[PDB]
Symmetry: C3
Subunit: 92 residues, 3 copies
């Protein structure tokens, strides 16, 4: 794919508050992470929030979790993050 032999990619799905999405996007950019943002809404409170999709090399997962924790995360705020396996990664 676009990944060198011997490494792996993960997919980060991070659900954060709308009021923090701006700060996270900027800090991901500063740190050379790529991201795609989704305007979403919560099942329980039924209010808008933001979901980021971040494809990242396995080697940098701790690093990106750290960024999410610093910029988002809690009485208020908070971030919910899933790390998911990726079979292949391509750019066309």
């Amino acid at each position: 794919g676009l990944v060198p032999r011997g490494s792996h990619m993960k997919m980060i799905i991070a659900i954060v508050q709308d009021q923090d999405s701006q700060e996270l996007a900027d800090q991901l950019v500063k740190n050379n992470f790529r991201a795609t943002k989704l305007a979403t809404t919560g099942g329980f409170l039924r209010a808008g929030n933001t979901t980021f999709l971040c494809g990242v090399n396995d080697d940098r997962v701790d690093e990106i979790l750290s960024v999410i924790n610093q910029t988002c995360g809690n009485e208020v705020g908070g971030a919910t993050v899933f790390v998911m396996p990726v079979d292949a990664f391509h750019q066309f």
Copy 2:
């Protein structure tokens, strides 16, 4: 992560009709499932539909499939569901 040693999380991606999204969200809440909703659109009919993202413990996958089937699912209606593996789950 946020998961006890010995268990695993799965990611449920459920594509349902807009007119059923309200009923599913309420029944997931009643049953202590967390969810994130995405306004989406179908590739074929090119009309709005709703996509839910639900992170759930492996032990409760049958339970949540049952909820989706009861609230959504078909001449009309219907639900399309993917169950996907999750490496880790965090809250910050």
Copy 3:
């Protein structure tokens, strides 16, 4: 699930330019692929783009990558694609 014993599904997540989303949706339809579309936005340029979710049988992954490459993909344009494992696939 909805998958015959011995095969597997993959989840394709494809991020493409808005101006190409129409052409991809039509070519996926012609080729008997199902798809769900998400209006998204890029982390870096902060402009609208489109994310497709495509559940596909393992046997057809090369085929669908080929469609994405032909319709989207680059001085301009371009497509970013993740192939992800799927545990189960259901329709209700």
